[PDB]
Amino acid sequence: GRLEEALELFEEMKEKGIVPDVVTYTTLISGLGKAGRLEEALELFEEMKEKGIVPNVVTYNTLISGLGKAGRLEEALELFEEMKEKGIVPDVVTYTTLISGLGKAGRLEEALELFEEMKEKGIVPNVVTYNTLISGLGKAGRLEEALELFEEMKEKGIVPDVVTYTTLISGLGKA
Ligand SMILES: [Ca+2]
């Protein structure tokens, strides 16, 4: 968490002409991320790309997660499509974040399309994903799809939790 010291060292090595690499950039972006200094993280990301250092799934996850937590879904989505253009395969954390973000933003139909997509690519959904979708579907009256998803997660052995049930029972209750 001694991030200000980390950044000084970063500059220093650059002044000395010791070339930073992906672990350097990732550690810093990741740190800046956790500290909520997202814009500085993104500036570093730009610079890294300008220098030809190739980012990887950890870098993208951090930024997408930070952007998602901040409601900045359009930029998150831009990064998501970029990492795919570069052959950097998204992971469960990536999808879970976006589906969350899109859910929170009530962009439910888009959340469901990402869900469809992640299964095509063989990324396995987990309880947070199913919860987000089932909650979103339930809040919107769409109870039969909610129940389809509920049945599906049980088939896959993704075990539902209290919020899952509470949502569906709520929906079935006042509907
Ligand atoms: Ca782009």
Side-chain angles (χ1 to χ4, degrees), residues 84-138:
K84 294 193 287 171
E85 282 158 11
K86 292 176 171 221
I88 298 169
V89 184
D91 65 20
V92 48
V93 190
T94 325
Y95 280 100
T96 275
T97 299
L98 295 163
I99 284 146
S100 287
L102 288 159
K104 216 266 201 179
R107 301 173 59 181
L108 179 62
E109 200 65 17
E110 293 168 86
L112 287 169
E113 300 186 30
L114 273 189
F115 180 61
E116 297 179 337
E117 163 180 335
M118 109 195 251
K119 294 188 286 176
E120 282 302 340
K121 289 169 184 286
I123 312 314
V124 185
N126 55 28
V127 41
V128 151
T129 313
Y130 279 102
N131 278 1
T132 296
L133 296 171
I134 288 178
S135 162
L137 284 169

Side-chain angles (χ1 to χ4, degrees), residues 1-115:
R2 308 172 57 179
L3 202 65
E4 295 302 326
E5 280 169 302
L7 291 165
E8 288 179 46
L9 246 42
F10 183 61
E11 281 303 307
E12 182 181 308
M13 84 185 290
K14 264 145 50 179
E15 178 177 7
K16 283 173 191 284
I18 289 147
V19 186
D21 65 34
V22 27
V23 169
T24 322
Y25 279 104
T26 300
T27 293
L28 291 171
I29 282 163
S30 175
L32 283 167
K34 302 183 192 315
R37 296 161 65 181
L38 193 56
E39 205 69 21
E40 297 170 61
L42 291 168
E43 301 185 35
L44 233 32
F45 181 59
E46 298 172 319
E47 158 179 332
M48 171 188 203
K49 281 183 292 176
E50 287 297 338
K51 302 279 202 46
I53 315 301
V54 195
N56 58 28
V57 49
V58 163
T59 318
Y60 282 102
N61 283 342
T62 312
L63 298 164
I64 292 169
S65 166
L67 284 162
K69 195 93 59 267
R72 299 173 62 182
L73 259 305
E74 293 312 298
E75 194 159 357
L77 286 167
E78 282 178 3
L79 251 50
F80 181 62
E81 291 293 308
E82 182 180 296
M83 75 185 290
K84 294 193 287 171
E85 282 158 11
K86 292 176 171 221
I88 298 169
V89 184
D91 65 20
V92 48
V93 190
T94 325
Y95 280 100
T96 275
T97 299
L98 295 163
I99 284 146
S100 287
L102 288 159
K104 216 266 201 179
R107 301 173 59 181
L108 179 62
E109 200 65 17
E110 293 168 86
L112 287 169
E113 300 186 30
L114 273 189
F115 180 61

